[PDB]
Amino acid sequence: ATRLDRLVTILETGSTRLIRDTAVNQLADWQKQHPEELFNLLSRVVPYLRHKDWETRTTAAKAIGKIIENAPLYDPNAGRPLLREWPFERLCEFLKVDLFDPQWETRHGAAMGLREVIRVHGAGAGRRRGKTRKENNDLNRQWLDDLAYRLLCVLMLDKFTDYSSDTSVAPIRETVGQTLGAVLRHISVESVHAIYRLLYCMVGMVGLRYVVAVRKDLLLQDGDMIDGVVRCVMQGLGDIDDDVRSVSAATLIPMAKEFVMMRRSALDSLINIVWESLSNLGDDLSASTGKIMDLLATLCSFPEVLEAMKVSASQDEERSFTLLVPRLYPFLRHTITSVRLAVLKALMTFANLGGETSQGWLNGRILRLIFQNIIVERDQDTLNMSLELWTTLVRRLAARDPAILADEFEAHAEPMMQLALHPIGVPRHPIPMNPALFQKPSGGTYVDGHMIQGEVDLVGVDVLIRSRISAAKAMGLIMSFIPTPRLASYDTAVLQALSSPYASTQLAAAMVIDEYAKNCSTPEVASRFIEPLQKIIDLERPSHYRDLVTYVQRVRSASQQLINLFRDHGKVSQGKLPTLAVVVQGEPEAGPGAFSIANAEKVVNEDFERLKRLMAPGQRLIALPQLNEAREQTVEVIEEAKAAKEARDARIKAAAACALVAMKVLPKKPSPLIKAIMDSIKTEENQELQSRSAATIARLVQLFTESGRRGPAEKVVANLVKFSCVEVAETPEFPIHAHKTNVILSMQYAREAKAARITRRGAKEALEILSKNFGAELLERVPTLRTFMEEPLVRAFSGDLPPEARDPENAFGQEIVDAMSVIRTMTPTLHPALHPFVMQQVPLVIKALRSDLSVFRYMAAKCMATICSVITVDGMTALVEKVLPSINNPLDLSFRQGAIEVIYHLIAVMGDAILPYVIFLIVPVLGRMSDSDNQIRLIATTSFATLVKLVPLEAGIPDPPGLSEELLKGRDRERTFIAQLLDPKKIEPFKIPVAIKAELRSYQQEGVNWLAFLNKYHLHGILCDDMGLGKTLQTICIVASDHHQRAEEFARTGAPEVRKLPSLIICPPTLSGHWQQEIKTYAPFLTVTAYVGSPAERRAMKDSLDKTDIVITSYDVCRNDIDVIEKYNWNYCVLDEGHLIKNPKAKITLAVKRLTSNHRLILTGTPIQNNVLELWSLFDFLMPGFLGAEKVFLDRFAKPIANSRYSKASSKEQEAGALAIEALHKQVLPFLLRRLKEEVLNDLPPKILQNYYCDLSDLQRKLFEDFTKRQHIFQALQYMRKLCNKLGALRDLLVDCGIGPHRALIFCQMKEMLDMVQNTSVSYLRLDGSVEANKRQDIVNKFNSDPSYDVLLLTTSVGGLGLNLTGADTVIFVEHDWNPQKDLQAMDRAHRIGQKKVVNVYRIITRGTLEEKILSLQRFKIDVASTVVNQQNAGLATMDTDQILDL
């Protein structure tokens, strides 16, 4: 596949918007470089316009526009409703012909595409070559008129609308309007007249939005064509329907500037109609008022509109701002959020007008209404806008005079203070505010019922608390602005609140004090609130709060149940205990003897013991278990009440401490202040108060640093660093993972999970604000953080390793990870001045990534990912120069593991930013997908799933500006590296030109070329050539070349990448003598070891395995000794006859697949013999996971292959098998190199095949017919095989073959037929395996030399490779095996390179019996095997390799 096919698919399958933006940019640049092939891109991007996904259609339209923008401009001269040559002529016609399609997606795409095409190329449309210039201009006018006509017809017929949101959306209308706006830029003014007449000024409006706003400067002041549109818009504004009003308002707002400039006269009528339409209180569910107010704000922003409005109030004040803008006040509490937000934004625009008009309507009314908005709001955005408007209004009102602010809000201050300092209840027992405190927009006393009532169950407690803090900020600001002598009521209100029986009111009072302190000119002003706050934090807290009366009453009910019901059950007489106090503590008019938690403790312990002692004997035994249950329940309720009291006390203390630190108090004895603040950093579920406490600590540290005292400062910094590391998911508990080694951590009570993460959230926010405060100087001001971060990093350097570092009970094993978490936690928020510090520490983090400690590698991967995210160029230089080189180390498993986990986390954190470095990252992941370690393979697969999608973009990403010279050189060399993989072009093969090195034939040259290609990119294969082509030479050549290259590189480097690792070869016993001879005669500079030996002898060379370059071992010697052989690693691992390991269940496969090797190769001649699962078993050894698990491969390939055995060209079965073989062929294409003996050898005569058919004998026929009436299924097959036994055919064939000058081999699968002596001159030998193996060589060598022997009989399965029987020129088969490859091997005897004459093969196939099925199965297996290996060569192999590694 080309680059374009993968580049276009990103527009639909792109993971993020930036990836698709880069895809369209790359595609546009592609068209720029290759301007001759616009249609190739267009034909592939256009079909997305009718896709169902919205984003795909938008991206396809943008891609079409940017592709077309680079082509040259063209200048060849010098009422059915819609419900759910010119170079681009056919494209535009295809868009217009489905612009009336029923499906709305097609219309949306068509409109977008037409817009994009015409936007850049509208001028040259419609013209035809050969016509004159002027007539072509007329044709262009006709074309644009036709397009405008068709688009306007589309606009007036489409009714598709979306009502999901309040503001209805018409996608087709909007796109068609933008298409008109694109069209109308190029036409002449006559066509503009025609279109304006067509879209007559009546009420289309969305059509008007782009019929104007194009050719704007010429339409201005153009008589009727600009005078009628204002009438149309004004009529629309006054219309009844909300939809047309909203559309007209949205149509006028972008054109408001030039519609204002059109006339000064029209402004009076326009603003009159706008204010009149807004004056009428619209329907409750209408979002139109937002558009109307946006229009009002935009119109009032222009100076001439302000002049007109000032002129309008000529005879009276009716049209002045002061009387009008209160018309906006009713909509402040409208149900739809958009209307409320619009009201606030319009009021802010009006407030920021200036011009001495704002003083009119600014008064206490709007301030009180905005304060009510703050109190009763639930939406975050509207609350923020309300507080912003409040601040701007207060600042504007204080600009005139602080006294004006102080006495304007004096009328309203006390009720708003009651609202701000109001308590909060519990879910089912609210504490409602008085509705008389709220004013109406046009009334003295009051949709917001839930917030007023204080119903915490219906509106969450977070919303109530947020309203309280917002009110506190507003009231603190307004206190700060107004003069001090006027603050008597304010200060006494908050002082009385600080002593209230409630808990919430005290919190609100502290918040108001804190905000007043913050907003003051200097902190000393607010010093009158000092000692009440110190009384809050120092003096003991109240024993109760009115908010917890529900808890105490629950305790009272449970205690009463315990006292009463279970003693009635227990039969204890009256007078058992005095009755509990009826009134609970904390309630109003509760006496000093009111029920309290202390009474609950007394009854549940002392009275419980007393009553137990008072119970009669025997009845106590009956009663006690229910008494125990009731007692435990009572204790639980008491604990709940006490916990609630503790939480309220802690919150009040935290707020008081925040107030004290805010006014710059630094007590000489800071014992309780820091305690309260840190308690509110630990156990604060409310995010807002936690952030406030975080800011409090960040300011406290700075104040103490300026004071010079540092004890508590360092203590709190240490405590913050401690709390930042409490979350398990961000820093694990070392005592658990101390026992895990060489495992990827990334692949591996409910109450506490929340506490840990909230504490870590608070600490992290505190640390971030601290860093932002200190700026550049943080590394100078505070050194305790430095020690926490750094002391285990400079420790453990130079290979240092305390033995206690591995001790689960040593705290330093946890302190190491606690230290290393802070780098990730803090580096992104540090100043750039500290980037050199982290850069200087990167050499420590990289070594932590190479360290053999698993948690070291985990934390180093995380920290390197972060550092490369934020300190991009330096961190990535370190990564590419000193991590990725280590990814290939065979022995250092830690190096590879850490260096792959770093890539995992780097991708996960950087996301889209990793585009320029995928060229560095791709090759390591490709290599490690097939690594020996299981978890490295898994995470490499996950990383590759992300990198492959971005690989097509890497060829054109703009270089980052700051890349070091090393990174530019790295990018260049990696480009040249990948170019050979992703291009069919290839290089001269890899060879070492040693003087004694042997000569290579052409096919061997191609084979070593293929092996070197595999070697470079760390891919594995099968050299499945036919026997007799010399695979040993190629194998030892590539192994020696690799060993020579590594050894030479080890002299030019010091890294542990090269270690002179051994190489293992597993052969059958008979071929070791060939392997050693070939290695010695072709690679003298290689050393050889032969582990194959007696069971005891192997210990004499056990340690010699790790000391010799090439090690040779047998399959069975490896099997019996795998438990010791698995403990070594090898550079190469070669299986000489890999068809031994085809059955996955066989123990030889289980043994061989445990051989951890860097490179891995199978030599064979029949990778697939009976079933594709043989190929799966081989590739499970070569590239684990490449073809999936067992079930996946079975379902994908094997079942269709089996089902295709019986088919008659039917689409039900033939198609499935064909697709299965095609997929398996494409998947395994680059990793098999089959070359036929016919292609290589120049001297090997042809082989001919003929079948011999004969009918079954009479006696055998009768016996079979009898047997049909007559266990296991296979015994019938065996019996049929036996009774099928030809001798006349064999006799006639032998006589025809000159026997009894001509020779033959006779193969029989059945031994009992091979010894038959029927037909009573012919001398024959027998080789049936039962003969001793040594005697076989003598027999065959006797047969081979002299011509006195005419025939030689043998069974098919006798002898392995090398059983050369060359004298024969005919081969006769009498019974055929289930395996066709065994018959082919039997034919290969007497067809070797030493063969001299033509070889003819004959088969005796008796008709109407099992043998026909045998041959049918054989040809089926032959076809299935051959079709999978049909086309194998380096150049012929498809270079889409990256797209295959997806299981």
Partner DNA sequence: CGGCCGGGCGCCCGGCATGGCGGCCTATAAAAGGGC
Partner DNA sequence: GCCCTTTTATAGGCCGCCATGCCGGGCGCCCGGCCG
Q: For the segment 1396-1425, give every residue that binds DNA (CB under 7 A).
A: 1417
751 binds DNA (CB under 7 A): no
Q: State the minimum distance, in angstroms, from the CB of residue 1308 to DNA.
A: 8
Residue 84 annotated as lining a ligand binding site = no
322 binds DNA (CB under 7 A): no
1092 binds DNA (CB under 7 A): yes
1335 binds DNA (CB under 7 A): no
* 1275 versus 1321: smaller Cβ distance to DNA: 1275
1199 binds DNA (CB under 7 A): yes
Nearest to 555 by CA among 624, 456, 630, 628: 630
* 524 versus 1315: smaller Cβ distance to DNA: 1315
Size of the site for DNA (CB under 7 A): 48
Residue 453 annotated as lining a ligand binding site = no
Angstrom distance (rounded) from CA 1263 to CA 211: 97
1194 binds DNA (CB under 7 A): yes
Given 1360, 1394, 1408, 1435, the residue binding DNA (CB under 7 A): 1360
* 656 versus 1198: smaller Cβ distance to DNA: 1198
Residue 1442 has which token pair? 């990256």
Radius of gyration from C-alpha coordinates of the chain: 45
1337 binds DNA (CB under 7 A): no
Given 815, 1106, 1116, 1215, the residue binding DNA (CB under 7 A): 1116
* 558 versus 1414: smaller Cβ distance to DNA: 1414
Given 1005, 1378, 1415, 1439, the residue binding DNA (CB under 7 A): 1378
1099 binds DNA (CB under 7 A): no
Breaks (C-N over 2.5 A) in the chain follow: 78, 84, 203, 446, 748, 1270, 1285, 1300, 1320
1246 binds DNA (CB under 7 A): no
Residue 1392 annotated as lining a ligand binding site = yes
101 binds DNA (CB under 7 A): no
* Structural element, H or E, at residue 1194: none
Q: State the minimum distance, in angstroms, from the CB of residue 793 to DNA.
A: 44
Q: 655, 690 in Cβ contact below 8 A?
A: no
Residue 1137 annotated as lining a ligand binding site = yes
1279 binds DNA (CB under 7 A): no
1147 binds DNA (CB under 7 A): yes
CA distances from 897 to 517, 745, 1074, 1127 (A): 55, 10, 39, 19
134 binds DNA (CB under 7 A): no
Given 432, 783, 832, 1069, the residue binding DNA (CB under 7 A): 1069
1070 binds DNA (CB under 7 A): yes
DSSP H helix total and E strand total for the chain: 65, 12
Given 500, 1379, 1427, 1433, the residue binding DNA (CB under 7 A): 1379
* 1096 versus 1436: smaller Cβ distance to DNA: 1096
How far from chain centre, in Å, is Cα 634?
Answer: 50
Q: 214, 185 in Cβ contact below 8 A?
A: yes
Residue 1136 annotated as lining a ligand binding site = yes
Q: State the minimum distance, in angstroms, from the CB of residue 1112 to DNA.
A: 11
CB count within 10 Å of CB 1254 equals 13
* 889 versus 1113: smaller Cβ distance to DNA: 1113
Given 1114, 1131, 1204, 1432, the residue binding DNA (CB under 7 A): 1114
1207 binds DNA (CB under 7 A): no
Q: For the segment 1151-1170, give every residue that binds DNA (CB under 7 A).
A: 1169-1170
Nearest to 367 by CA among 416, 324, 321: 416
Given 719, 1357, 1364, 1400, the residue binding DNA (CB under 7 A): 1357
454 binds DNA (CB under 7 A): no
Hey, is 275 helix, strand or coil? helix
1273 binds DNA (CB under 7 A): yes
How far from chain centre, in Å, is Cα 282?
Answer: 47
Which residues fall within 8 angstroms of residue 334, CB to CB, at 6 or more apart? 284, 289, 340, 343
1088 binds DNA (CB under 7 A): no
Given 573, 798, 1275, 1320, the residue binding DNA (CB under 7 A): 1275
Residue 806 has which token pair? 């591995």
Given 911, 1068, 1184, 1362, the residue binding DNA (CB under 7 A): 1068
Given 994, 1358, 1415, 1447, the residue binding DNA (CB under 7 A): 1358
DSSP for 1000-1066 reads: --HHHHHHHHHHHHHHHHT--EEE-PPTTS-HHHHHHHHHHHHHHHHHHHHHS--STT-----EEEE
Which listed range, 343-351, 428-436, 959-967, 1191-1199, lies at the site for DNA (CB under 7 A)?
1191-1199
Residue 1327 has which token pair? 């080789």
Angstrom distance (rounded) from CA 726 to CA 711: 23
Hey, is 1089 helix, strand or coil? strand
* 949 versus 1119: smaller Cβ distance to DNA: 1119
1143 binds DNA (CB under 7 A): yes
- Per-residue burial over 560-594, b if 16 or more Cβ lie within 10 Å, else e, is eebbeebbeebebeeebbeebeebbbbbeebeeeb
1310 binds DNA (CB under 7 A): yes
**1324-1327/1370-1373 β-pairing:** unpaired
Which listed range, 269-277, 613-621, 1233-1241, 1323-1331, lies at the site for DNA (CB under 7 A)?
1323-1331
1330 binds DNA (CB under 7 A): yes
Nearest to 206 by CA among 236, 185, 228: 236
Angstrom distance (rounded) from CA 1321 to CA 91: 87
Place of tokens 């998947």: 1227
Nearest to 885 by CA among 947, 973, 986, 795: 973
Residue 1004 annotated as lining a ligand binding site = yes
Nearest to 1070 by CA among 1354, 1325, 1327, 1364: 1364
Q: State the minimum distance, in angstroms, from the CB of residue 1168 to DNA.
A: 11
Angstrom distance (rounded) from CA 250 to CA 1011: 68
* 34 versus 1147: smaller Cβ distance to DNA: 1147
Q: State the minimum distance, in angstroms, from the CB of residue 1426 to DNA.
A: 17
Residue 1031 annotated as lining a ligand binding site = yes
- Per-residue burial over 898-922, b if 16 or more Cβ lie within 10 Å, else e, is bbbbbbbbbbebbeeebbbbbbbbb
CA distances from 1016 to 332, 449, 1013, 1019 (A): 71, 74, 5, 8
Amino acid at 1001: R
Which listed range, 595-603, 1058-1066, 1188-1196, 1395-1403, lies at the site for DNA (CB under 7 A)?
1188-1196
Which residues fall within 8 angstroms of residue 757, CB to CB, at 6 or more apart? 727, 729
Place of tokens 């004694």: 996
CB count within 10 Å of CB 1360 equals 12
Residue 1281 annotated as lining a ligand binding site = no
164 binds DNA (CB under 7 A): no
Angstrom distance (rounded) from CA 448 to CA 295: 28
1213 binds DNA (CB under 7 A): no
* 823 versus 1354: smaller Cβ distance to DNA: 1354
580 binds DNA (CB under 7 A): no
For DNA, the binding residues (CB under 7 A) are 1068-1070, 1092, 1094-1095, 1114, 1116-1117, 1119-1120, 1140, 1142-1143, 1145-1148, 1169-1170, 1190-1191, 1194-1195, 1199, 1272-1275, 1277-1278, 1309-1312, 1328-1330, 1332-1333, 1355, 1357-1360, 1378-1379, 1417
Q: Which residues are annotated as a binding site?
A: 999, 1004, 1031-1032, 1136-1137, 1364, 1392
Going by the annotation, the residues of the binding site for Mg(2+) are 1136-1137
Q: Which residue ranges make up the annotated binding site for ADP? A: 999, 1004, 1031-1032, 1364, 1392
